Each structure stands twice: as structure tokens, then as C-alpha cells.
């Protein structure tokens, strides 16, 4: 209870990509805000994630995005200019696998760290993880 | 005038009847309310008959009504009829609605439109232009005192 | 109109206020002074122009006027004046205004010595590098004593900094960029408040000055890079500090420019903010924003070899090539012969277009903010690098100019037109200029007390013009050009078309 | 042959194409500031060769007319569903028929983003259309009222203009009118039922429920949300707090499936509508 603004925990547990973890996180989010706001008184990214929650679950598992929608309705509608933090760009990150062999190193490590990590981590794939072992 | 207008069937006794009523309208006194009522009557009178003659006149007629309507402040029928008169597409069916956008605090955008209309009137492409010179004059005193 | 109003501070809200419409019909001067001052605290430039200014009777009625100063100070928190205090403190060298020479230390005694030292940075213009100047120089030791009862470690830097500035007038050994973390930096700033409050004493400090201390530009420059903290930028170059009129007015007007919840920030046409305070009447280094780009070199690079590359290098020379019709063809042709091949800047610099809009919906804001109060600017012309077509961040900030200097008459660009908008800077005339002209709200003292005073310094009529603008913005083109008419009129006033043709061939128009 | 299936594979190929396009922008920006640090931004045979390589890769720009076809794929993604269409018109055609046929999608690009500042800032600036079209476009501008008059009477006195009628009218938020306009075809319902709820009368909104539910099989995504919204507001006026929960929950299940959308895609203040009826639902 002492921990005050603990949004990033929601950020991380909604970044979690599995049904049960997100369910338990999200219903917790509801039960949270209900009482907490009945009392009195970051706010953006819970909705920011819930967007993806519904969007991925907009072809799978109606109920998931249902609970998502219920909670966001519970949340509100967020005046635009104040408190809007939608991203601007990503990482194509020119890294020069060409000359500057140091940047070749940068290029290679970039390839790994970008996506190969969760791929090597979250994937449910035996053989690819074998390629993972070998080429990692 | 009405009972007459359903007693004159031929396009010569009704057509003459048009001049008859045209003079008849003179006496009505300069007061809008009366002109309003009478013109409303004859306008209902058209679409009732749906024939070529007042077919080809009712938009001009409503326009005549809106003329008084806005020299004494109501554009209801002005826009409520411009659309109609554009099926018969008068040479004023544009510039006077420009004018009605003009009588309000609006002058500038209606002015871009009627500067285009001043180009279209040097490009008169029309009758000898004395009456039609008056409309170019009409846009003239936009900028005359802008 | 004031007495029960402070119940609707009411100390004097009645007596002369009994005549609170006397002007609608110094006793009443000071009456208005105090009234407009406390116009919000029992829940304009008038005094700021009476500092240096019947006569016996009003002076008798100025006794309460020349007396209630510290009365307001104690009664007031008490920081409203502090903005004007700093604005004057950038050039610090009726008792209600006569008590102001020591006001620099007065701001320090009761409250934040941090913002006080921020102002001391401005006072270092004389401290480093008058009956008030010498008084301040003496009282600086007294100022430190009063702050006490590392104070000298917040005041001894002026000697070394003045030595450095003089050596600049006179790459590392002469400078030896020194002084790790201390009270502040070259990062002069808003010092924000309520209108949290700790911002009023903003504490952007300098971790380690970069030891390069070198730039050597065409005019004057000696800059450094980030060696101090999160971000920085400064150049201890040679330039008269008088131009900061525009600089301070912009940062200040940013307030009302962000006044209302969505009623002044949706479009939120925005340009630039940072504060400054020089070390001498001819030199200084201060804060700014990032992504520096060179306008004139960019004009050269637009189409390089024998093409839209800038050909106005003889701006100082072809100024005599100004002509009516020959230079009409010349400059109109140069418009295409320096065409806008920089339209790539955003769209290509912001590809996938998720980026194009990401800063382009603010580029709309900014290049609508090119005309906050524009056509009355009446300043000088843009020679080579005046504008800053920065990237990675949409903005615009003109280079220094002055007021009403034509000499060839210069006045009474096309590259900005065709590229902009999407196929032309058409939206720039109206789309958000509306807002840029829809200003109108409650600046009833803003423009006067700040900007009108600044224009007067650098160089009811203005108030009637303000009221006309206000009412006209609210109505359908008021009576004259006052809404969309005003937008188009201002556009055409700033851009007499064939004048770009018939342009002074020094600038080779666009 | 295939529609969405083929388009999905084509968009995956266009994602790879977009990756490649963005790659060089990400790349050469690094490259030339690395060459500038080595005293020679473009002053190097290798730098020129690199620029030539980039030009060769870009040579899949491949008839900016073909790029016009690719933009004519008209991505749900608004941003470059603009960018190359921008290019398609920008310098290239300036051709009266080309210009006119493009003006159609230029307005649709402003519609894709949402903010229609170019409706009068580009289309009406170039006077696209006649005086009738000018009057219609004028509505958003401070002139909206008499235009609404005519654009209502014409709807009384050509049904496809009736939908535009209801849209503009509803856009003056004047639900208190559309409740009366034609309370005594399909696209109109979204307009009408909203007012039929908003004004709040247990007698006309009964009638709108009756009118909607009689339809064959709506099967349509729009109207059902507002239908749920309404069919809630019988119980509230008849005091059964049990079932109101059921209908509002079903409202969630709808809104949370179809109208709920992609993650971010440039949409901020226009999401409001969709999210704000949700807020009020809560």
C-alpha cells in the first residue's frame, strides 16, 4: 500500500503475453481502481496496453477484450493534449554490418537483442530453439 | 388574380394574365407582409399545375419574394429557394446568394467568390449588359468601400 | 466595484474606488495601481511606466502610493512582480519604485536565493565585464552577508568568467573550462510557479564546462558541447545583449499561449522557449533547444551546382541591384532558382509517415505560430540564416533583427509556399492562423504590460485596437477584416506578391 | 481472386517493402553523419557509391505512377496512404483530369486522419465543385445554419442526400431535432436512434426500439451498439437494476469486439466518441 504510483507494474504485467497472467493482472487492476478512486485523487499506459489487449483478442477470446473494455470504461476518456504518450518511432537502427567492424559488432548484437531474445525465450518451438542454441 | 388564373387556360390568356397580375402587383404598398402573403399564394398555385409556363417562373417568383424578405431581414426563403432556382439557374441565382452571404458580417469569402464572379462578368457572355452591368456594379461597391 | 467585491485585500477597495469609474467619468492613478494589482487576491504597465513618473495634490496622494509597496509585498505569496524584476535585472547597472535598486537582494532575503542567483547571473553582466551599478557592486558582499545573516562560492565566478570573456575579446589554456557542479549553468530558464513552486527557483546547474571552448564562426562564436549533464548548448560569442527583447517576450507569452485547457492548447501553435542573461553588453552564452541546422547552407544544398542553390551571397552587394521590373523578373525567377528542395525535410526525415504526422501535426502548429502577432512586427529582412528549418522536431525561430530599418525601403518566401501545406503553404494562410489570430482572450494587460512596453523600450489607442481584435475575432468578420478576412489580409500584407518579383536583388527573393 | 486473404499477404509484402524503405532512411542518415565526422560527408568515392547503391535500391520506386497504384492500395494505415499519394499529386501530374480524379482521394486522406482542415484549406481553396458543393462544404465554417436549412428542406424536397442530411444535422448535435425530423434508408438509423436515446423519452424511444428490432437481420456493426445503449433505458425507467446490468454488459461485449480497433494508429481525439459513450455507460 505504501508503494504509490505503481503503474509500471501494470505496464509489465500487461506486456506479459499470456491469457492467465493478463487476466489476473487486469481483474486486479479493476478491483484496484474501483476502491482507489472511490477514495480520492501512468494513467495513460494502462489504456495504452488495454488497446493491444483487445486488438490481439479482437480475433481471439471475446471475453478477454470484454474485461479489457469494461475496465477501460471504468477508466475514462483522457483529454488528448494533456496526458497522451503514444510512441513516435522504432529501431531500424543503422548499425553498419558493413565497414566499421565495431559497428558490425553493433549490428550483430542488435540483431540478437532486438527480437531474437524473446523469440529464444517465449517461443514454444523445440527445433528453432535448437537453431537458437547453435547460432547464438 | 387566382380565380382568373384558373379561368385562363391558353398560353395567351394566361400569358397575358401574367402581365395583368404584373401591373396588379404595383398597388400593394411598399410593405413586405402583404407581398409575402400574395406571392406565397401564387407559388402554391404552380406545382399544383405542373406545366411549362409557371414551371419556368416559380423560382424567379420566390426570388422576388426573398428580395423583400431580406431588404427587411429574413434569409429563410432566400436559401430555402436558391437551391430551387438553380434547377432553372438564374444569372442572379448565384450573385444574390453571394449578396446574402454578403449582408451579414460576412464580406471576405463572399468577396473571393464575387471577384471570381467579376471575372465571369467581364466574361459577360450574355445580354447587352445594362441590367447585367448593374450586377458588376454591385460587386464594384464591395471593394469600393471595403 | 471593489469594496464588497473582495467579499464578492478589501482594505482600500472603496475610498478612491468610490470613483473606480472616475476615468469613466496620485489618488486615482495609484487607486488603479493597487486595484489592478490586487484584482485577484481576496478570495498592467501603469506602475511599470510610472517608475520614472494637482502635481502637489497627486504627490500628496502618491504618499500612499509610494508607501504601499512593501505593504503589498508583505501582504502578498508575493512573486508576481518577480518576472518584471528579472526582466529589468538583465540590465541592472516614488519609493514604491525608488526602493528597487536593492530589490535584487530583497528577492533573495525572504525567498529563494536560487532564483535570486539566477537573477545574479543577469547582474553578472556588470559584475563580470552607475549610481545603481556601483551600489550593487558594493552590496554584493552585503548581499552574501544578508543571505548568511559557499556564498562566495556562488559569487566568486564572475572574476574568472570576465577573464574568459575578455580573453575571448583579447583554445583551452586561455579558457580552461572549469567550475564543476554549482548553483546554476548557462541554462537560464522560466523559473516556473503557480499563477512545484520550487520551479520559480529553477536549478538547472552546470556539471562540467566542456574544455574545447572553441567554434570560430563567420561573425562571432566560441561554443562548447555537452560535458555537464543531461543536455546543454551555449556559445560565448560576441553580440549585443539588447536583442533579448524578443527572447524574453516569447518565453513569457508562452504562458497565455498555453492559457486555456483546450481553448488555447489544442492547435497550440508553438515556436521556442529558453531564457538568457549575458556577461557584457556585447557577449554571452545561454540555453536553447536541440537539432541545429543551417538555413543558408541548406539553400545552397537544395539544388547545388547551378541551380536552386542560394545565389544571394551578394546580399550585401546586390542590395544596389534592387529594381522595379528588371529585379522583378530577377527575384521572381530566383524564386524558382532557389526553389524549396527542402520539402524532403519532414516527410523523408519522418518516414513510414507515422513519423511524418508525429511531428507534422506540430509542424502545423509551429508554422501557424509563424504569425502569433505577425504583420505588425515590421522588423528587418531575412538575409541568409534568419529562419531555422530544424528537423527531428518541428519549429521556427528567426535570427536577430531590429525595427523599421529598410534603406532601399525593403518593405512597406516563395520557397515557404509551394513546399508547405501538402502542395503549397495554403493552410498556412488560414487553417490555424485563425487561432494565431483568434488570440483575443484575456491579454488585456499581457500585450501592453509586457510586449507594448518592450516595443516602446526597444524603439488607450493600443487598448482600443486590442478590444477591436477581441470582439472581431469572436464575431463573423466584425465590421472590417476581423476573422478569416483578417487571416487573408495579414497573409497578403506580409506577402505582397509581385514585390517578391520586384524585390531587392540582394536577397534574390526565394 | 481472393480479397482480404490476398490483401493480407500483399500487406505482409508491403510491410517488408516498408521495412526496406525505412531501412535506407534509418541508414544513410547515420552514414552521412559518419562520413561528415571523417571530414567528407559526400566528398568520398565510397560515399558517392553508397548514394548510388541507395538510388539503385530506390529504383524500385519504379514508375512513381506505379507508386500511385501502390498508394491506390490505400492502406488502412493513414500515414503513407497519404505519403506516396501526396507524391503522386505533389509535383508530378498537375493534370486537370489527373488532378480532379486525385482530389477525391485527397479529401479521403484528410478523412482518414480525421482533422479536415484541408476540406476548405485545399479543396475549397481550389474550388472543387459547383455552388451547390460550395454551400455544402461551407457548413463546417462559421456558416452552418441556413445551409442546414436548405440541406434539410431538400431532404424533404434523391435519398442518398437524405443520409448526408442526417449526418450534417446530427453533426450540429441537434438530436432534439432529428427526433422530430423523420421519426415518422438504413444508414439513417445510426443517426436517428442516438437522438431517440439522448432526448430521453420512454415513449418515442419505445418506438425507435420497435422500429429497429423489426428489421430483418441487421448483421451490421454500427447500429447494434446504440441499440444496446437504448434497450438499457427501458429498465432504468422501469426500475429493474438486475437486467440493466445484463444489457450494459452486452454493450461491453459488442464494443469490446468490433468497434474496438488497432493499438494506436494516429487516432487520439477521434477515439473519444467511441470511448466516451463507454465512460458514460459506466
Swiss-Prot record, chain B:
Domain of life: Eukaryota
Effect of substituting residue 72 to S: In MEC1-100; impairs both the G1/S and intra-S damage checkpoints but not the G2/M damage checkpoint
Subcellular location: Nucleus
Complex and partners: Interacts with LCD1, which is required for localization MEC1 to the RPA complex. Interacts directly with the RPA subunits RFA1 and RFA2.
Role: Serine/threonine protein kinase which activates checkpoint signaling upon genotoxic stresses such as ionizing radiation (IR), ultraviolet light (UV), or DNA replication stalling, thereby acting as a DNA damage sensor. Recognizes the substrate consensus sequence [ST]-Q. Recruited in complex with protein LCD1 by the single-strand-binding protein complex RPA to DNA lesions in order to initiate the DNA repair by homologous recombination, after the MRX-complex and TEL1 are displaced. Phosphorylates LCD1 and RPA2, a subunit of RPA, involved in DNA replication, repair and recombination.
Family: Belongs to the PI3/PI4-kinase family. ATM subfamily.
Name of the protein in its database record: Serine/threonine-protein kinase MEC1
Gene coding for it: MEC1
Swiss-Prot record, chain C:
Region (Activation loop), start-end ranges: 398-413
Residue segments, region G-loop: 212-218
Positions of the UniProt region annotated as Binding to the RPA complex: 297-510
Result of altering residue 400 to E: Impairs kinase activity
Catalytic loop: region residues: 378-386
Domain PI3K/PI4K catalytic: 206-495
Compartment(s) of residence: Nucleus
Disulfide bonds: none
UniProt domain FATC: residue ranges: 479-510
Family that this chain belongs to: Belongs to the PI3/PI4-kinase family. ATM subfamily.
Function, as annotated: Serine/threonine protein kinase which activates checkpoint signaling upon genotoxic stresses such as ionizing radiation (IR), ultraviolet light (UV), or DNA replication stalling, thereby acting as a DNA damage sensor. Recognizes the substrate consensus sequence [ST]-Q. Recruited in complex with protein LCD1 by the single-strand-binding protein complex RPA to DNA lesions in order to initiate the DNA repair by homologous recombination, after the MRX-complex and TEL1 are displaced. Phosphorylates LCD1 and RPA2, a subunit of RPA, involved in DNA replication, repair and recombination.
Quaternary assembly: Interacts with LCD1, which is required for localization MEC1 to the RPA complex. Interacts directly with the RPA subunits RFA1 and RFA2.
Protein name: Serine/threonine-protein kinase MEC1
Organism per entry: Saccharomyces cerevisiae (strain ATCC 204508 / S288c)
Name of the gene this protein is made from: MEC1
Full-sequence range covered: 1785 to 2367 of 2368
Amino acid at each position: 500500500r505504501s508503494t504509490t504510483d505503481l503503474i509500471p507494474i501494470f505496464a509489465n504485467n500487461l506486456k506479459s503475453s499470456n491469457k492467465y497472467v493478463i487476466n489476473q493482472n487486469l481483474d486486479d487492476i479493476e478491483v484496484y481502481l474501483r476502491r482507489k478512486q472511490t477514495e480520492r485523487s501512468d494513467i495513460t499506459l494502462v489504456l495504452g496496453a488495454l488497446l493491444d489487449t483487445s486488438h490481439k483478442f479482437r480475433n481471439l477470446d471475446k471475453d478477454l477484450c470484454e474485461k479489457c473494455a469494461k475496465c477501460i470504461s471504468m477508466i475514462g476518456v483522457l483529454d488528448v493534449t494533456k496526458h497522451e504518450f503514444k510512441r513516435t518511432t522504432y529501431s531500424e537502427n543503422e548499425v553498419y554490418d558493413l565497414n566499421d567492424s565495431v559497428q558490425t559488432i553493433k549490428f550483430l548484437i542488435w540483431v540478437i537483442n532486438d527480437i531474437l531474445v524473446p523469440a529464444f525465450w517465449q517461443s514454444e518451438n523445440p527445433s528453432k530453439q535448437l537453431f537458437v542454441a547453435l547460432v547464438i | 388574380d387566382l380565380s382568373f388564373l384558373s379561368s385562363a387556360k391558353d398560353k395567351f390568356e394566361y400569358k397575358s394574365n401574367t402581365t395583368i397580375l404584373d401591373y396588379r402587383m404595383e398597388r400593394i404598398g411598399a410593405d413586405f407582409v402583404p407581398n409575402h402573403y400574395i406571392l406565397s399564394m401564387r407559388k402554391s398555385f404552380d406545382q399544383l399545375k405542373m406545366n411549362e409556363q409557371a414551371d419556368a417562373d416559380l423560382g424567379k417568383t420566390f426570388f422576388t419574394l426573398a428580395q423583400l424578405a431580406r431588404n427587411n431581414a429574413r434569409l429563410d426563403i432566400a436559401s430555402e429557394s436558391l437551391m430551387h432556382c438553380l434547377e432553372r439557374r438564374l444569372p442572379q441565382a448565384e450573385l444574390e446568394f453571394a449578396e446574402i452571404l454578403w449582408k451579414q458580417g460576412e464580406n471576405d469569402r463572399a468577396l473571393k467568390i464575387v471577384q471570381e464572379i467579376h471575372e465571369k462578368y467581364q466574361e459577360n457572355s450574355s445580354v447587352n449588359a445594362r441590367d447585367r452591368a448593374a450586377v458588376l456594379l454591385k460587386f464594384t461597391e464591395w471593394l469600393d468601400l471595403s | 466595484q471593489y469594496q464588497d467585491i473582495f467579499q464578492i485585500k478589501p482594505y482600500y477597495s472603496i475610498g478612491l474606488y468610490y470613483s473606480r469609474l472616475l476615468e469613466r467619468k496620485g489618488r486615482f492613478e495609484y487607486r488603479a495601481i493597487s486595484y489592478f494589482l490586487l484584482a485577484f487576491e481576496k478570495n498592467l504597465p501603469k506602475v511599470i511606466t510610472f517608475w520614472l513618473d494637482n502635481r502637489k495634490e497627486m504627490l500628496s496622494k502618491a504618499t500612499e502610493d509610494i508607501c504601499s509597496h512593501v505593504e503589498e509585498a508583505l501582504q502578498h505569496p508575493t512573486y508576481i512582480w518577480y518576472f518584471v524584476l528579472t526582466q529589468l535585472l538583465s540590465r541592472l547597472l516614488a519609493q514604491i519604485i525608488m526602493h528597487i535598486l536593492l530589490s535584487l537582494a530583497v528577492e533573495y532575503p525572504s525567498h529563494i536565493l536560487w532564483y535570486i542567483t539566477a537573477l545574479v547571473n543577469s547582474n553578472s553582466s556588470k559584475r563580470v565585464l552607475i549610481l545603481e551599478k556601483y551600489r550593487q557592486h558594493s552590496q554584493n558582499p552585503h548581499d552574501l552577508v544578508s543571505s548568511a545573516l559557499l556564498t562566495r562560492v556562488c559569487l566568486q565566478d564572475v572574476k574568472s568568467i570576465t577573464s574568459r570573456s575578455g580573453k575571448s575579446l583579447e583554445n583551452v589554456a586561455p579558457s580552461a573550462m572549469v567550475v564543476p557542479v554549482r548553483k546554476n549553468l548557462d541554462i537560464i530558464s522560466p523559473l516556473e510557479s503557480n499563477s512545484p513552486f520550487r520551479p520559480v527557483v529553477s536549478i538547472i546547474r552546470f556539471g562540467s564546462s566542456y574544455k574545447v571552448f572553441s567554434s570560430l564562426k563567420k561573425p562571432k562564436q566560441l561554443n562548447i558541447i555537452g560535458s555537464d549533464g543531461n543536455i546543454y548548448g551555449i556559445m560565448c560569442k560576441k553580440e549585443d545583449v539588447r536583442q533579448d527583447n524578443q527572447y524574453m517576450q516569447f518565453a513569457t507569452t508562452m504562458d497565455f499561449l498555453l492559457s486555456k485547457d483546450i481553448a488555447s492548447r489544442k492547435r497550440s501553435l508553438g515556436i521556442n522557449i529558453y531564457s538568457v542573461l549575458s556577461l557584457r553588453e556585447d557577449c554571452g552564452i545561454l540555453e536553447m533547444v536541440p537539432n541545429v541546422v543551417t538555413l543558408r547552407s541548406i539553400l545552397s544544398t537544395k539544388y547545388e551546382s547551378l541551380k536552386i542553390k542560394y545565389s544571394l551571397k551578394s546580399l550585401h552587394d546586390r542590395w544596389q541591384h534592387t529594381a522595379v521590373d528588371g529585379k522583378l523578373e530577377f527575384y521572381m525567377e530566383q524564386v524558382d532558382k532557389f526553389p524549396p528542395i527542402l520539402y524532403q525535410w519532414f516527410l523523408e526525415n519522418f518516414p513510414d509517415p507515422i513519423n511524418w504526422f508525429n511531428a507534422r501535426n506540430t509542424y502545423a502548429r509551429s508554422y501557424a505560430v509563424m504569425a502569433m502577432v505577425g504583420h505588425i512586427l515590421g522588423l528587418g529582412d531575412r538575409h541568409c540564416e534568419n529562419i531555422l528549418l530544424d528537423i527531428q522536431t518541428g519549429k521556427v525561430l528567426h535570427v536577430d533583427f531590429d525595427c523599421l530599418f529598410e534603406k532601399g525601403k525593403r518593405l512597406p518566401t516563395p520557397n515557404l509556399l509551394d513546399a508547405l501545406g501538402i502542395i503549397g503553404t495554403e493552410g498556412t494562410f488560414k487553417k490555424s492562423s485563425e487561432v494565431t489570430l483568434a488570440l483575443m482572450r484575456k491579454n488585456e494587460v499581457a500585450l501592453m504590460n509586457v510586449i507594448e512596453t518592450i516595443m516602446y523600450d526597444r524603439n488607450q489607442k493600443a487598448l482600443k485596437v486590442l478590444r477591436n481584435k477581441i470582439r472581431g475575432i469572436d464575431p463573423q468578420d466584425g465590421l472590417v477584416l476581423s476573422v478569416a478576412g483578417q487571416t487573408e489580409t495579414l497573409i497578403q500584407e506580409a506577402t505582397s506578391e509581385d514585390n517578391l518579383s520586384k524585390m531587392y536583388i540582394g536577397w534574390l527573393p526565394f | 481472386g481472393m480479397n482480404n486473404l490476398q490483401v493480407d499477404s500483399l500487406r505482409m509484402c508491403y510491410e517488408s517493402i516498408f521495412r526496406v524503405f525505412e531501412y535506407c532512411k534509418k541508414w544513410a542518415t547515420e552514414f552521412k553523419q559518419n562520413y561528415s565526422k571523417l571530414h567528407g560527408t559526400f566528398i568520398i568515392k565510397d560515399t558517392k557509391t553508397t548514394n548510388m547503391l541507395l538510388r539503385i535500391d530506390e529504383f524500385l520506386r519504379t514508375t512513381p505512377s506505379d507508386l500511385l497504384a501502390q498508394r491506390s492500395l490505400e492502406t488502412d494505415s493513414f500515414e503513407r496512404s497519404a505519403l506516396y499519394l501526396e507524391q503522386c499529386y505533389r509535383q508530378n501530374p498537375h493534370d486537370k483530369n489527373q488532378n480532379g480524379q486525385l482530389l477525391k482521394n485527397l479529401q479521403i486522406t484528410y478523412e482518414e486522419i480525421g482533422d479536415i482542415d484541408s476540406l476548405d484549406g485545399v479543396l475549397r481553396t481550389f474550388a472543387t465543385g459547383n455552388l451547390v458543393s460550395k454551400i455544402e462544404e461551407l457548413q463546417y465554417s462559421e456558416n452552418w445554419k441556413l445551409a442546414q436549412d436548405c440541406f434539410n428542406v431538400l431532404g424533404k424536397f434523391d435519398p442518398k442526400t437524405t443520409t448526408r442530411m442526417l449526418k450534417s444535422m446530427y453533426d450540429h448535435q441537434l438530436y432534439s431535432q432529428i427526433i422530430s425530423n423523420s421519426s415518422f434508408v438504413k444508414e439513417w438509423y445510426s443517426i436517428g436512434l442516438e437522438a431517440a436515446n439522448l432526448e430521453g423519452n420512454v415513449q418515442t424511444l419505445k418506438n425507435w426500439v420497435e422500429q429497429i428490432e423489426s428489421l430483418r437481420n441487421i448483421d451490421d456493426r454500427e447500429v447494434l451498439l446504440q441499440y444496446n445503449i437504448a434497450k438499457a433505458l427501458i429498465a432504468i425507467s422501469n426500475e429493474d437494476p438486475l437486467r440493466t446490468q445484463k444489457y450494459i454488459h452486452n454493450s461491453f461485449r459488442l464494443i469490446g469486439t468490433n468497434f474496438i480497433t488497432s493499438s494506436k494508429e494516429t487516432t487520439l481525439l477521434k477515439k473519444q466518441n467511441l470511448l466516451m459513450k463507454l465512460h458514460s455507460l459506466y
